[PDB]
Amino acid sequence: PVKPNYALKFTLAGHTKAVSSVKFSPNGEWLASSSADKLIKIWGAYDGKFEKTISGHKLGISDVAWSSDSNLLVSASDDKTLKIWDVSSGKCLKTLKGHSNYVFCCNFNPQSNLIVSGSFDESVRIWDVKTGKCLKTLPAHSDPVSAVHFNRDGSLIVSSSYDGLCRIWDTASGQCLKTLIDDDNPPVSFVKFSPNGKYILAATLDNTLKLWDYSKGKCLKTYTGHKNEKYCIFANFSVTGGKWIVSGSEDNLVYIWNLQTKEIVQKLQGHTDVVISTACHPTENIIASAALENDKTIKLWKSDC
Ligand SMILES: COc1cc(CN2CCc3c(cc(Cn4ccnc4C)cc3-c3cn(C)nc3C(F)(F)F)C2=O)cc(OC)c1
């Protein structure tokens, strides 16, 4: 494929404040969304059909993530907690307490016995899913933590922060294995491992995304053309068809790049505020996007490649 042809199929209205994060369930059936309105919503991944609302946090929610079997969700809230939810019943199974400021980002490990979180309190915490207890507190950064992600076998965690650092952590020991910097130390607004686990995709608040080989510390690709100077915006590897990079943008568009050539191959227009979050369906060429307070809708876009 040379270029995709993503076209708007559904617009998902229901949150009453900015949408903070959207994620597809690993089994492809569902989309979960979190919002500053303190709610989680569940939507059909293929038809946009509203499914249910999950409530219980006392303040807005920044992030949600799915367990590997698609049965559990974890949410990260301004109330300083994370919550583990059984999706099909809606019950809160555990409340994870320990952070001393907003919890901004979260993820399960692939085995989904652990949760990693990053907080405005500048720490990363590793939690046991079964007991809800904090296993490790990492003195990870000197500014809020903008992203945390496990690699494909769960042995590593990558974190990013406004302090301009990206760090790689040994899940088992909690030891910092690598600190990665970039010229002029722009805030690092997002990071995540590539699906094969060999690369790091990192956003910096200088309107730039970079694909890094973190082992050799070498920048392999640079993607520009979007607007990213103010917000932490999710980015993705799209792998079900053509190999793309996907990101939101502060000009209200979804950007899609060719991973190897770095050329913009499509811009998706429709949102009326910053596109803060995008996600890529695990098996079909479907993108979900979500926007800030002046918009508050989620959109599902479908491509033939
Ligand atoms: C002190 O300076 C700062 C400023 C900022 C700015 N900041 C704060 C608000 C915010 C931001 C990014 C994302 C997207 N997101 C979430 C998890 N991972 C990602 C990529 C969601 C939200 C958010 C949370 N809630 C409850 N409502 C929202 C919404 F904006 F949608 F209203 C964001 O950029 C961040 C920061 O440290 C991290 C330090």
Curated annotation (Swiss-Prot):
Residues of the signal peptide: none
Gene3D superfamilies, sorted: YVTN repeat-like/Quinoprotein amine dehydrogenase (2.130.10.10)
GO molecular-function term, one example from the UniProt record: histone binding
The keyword Cell membrane is annotated on this UniProt entry: no
Any one of the GO CC terms: MLL1/2 complex
Crosslink (Glycyl lysine isopeptide (Lys-Gly) (interchain with G-Cter in SUMO2)) position: K17
Main location: nucleus
Consequence when changing F104D: Strongly reduced affinity for histone H3
Cellular localisation: Nucleus
Documented effect of changing A18E: Strongly reduced affinity for histone H3
Repeat positions for WD: 14-53, 56-97, 99-139, 140-179, 183-224, 227-267, 270-304
Protein family per UniProt: Belongs to the WD repeat WDR5/wds family.
Protein name as it appears in the record: WD repeat-containing protein 5
The organism of origin for this protein: Homo sapiens
Gene from which the chain derives: WDR5
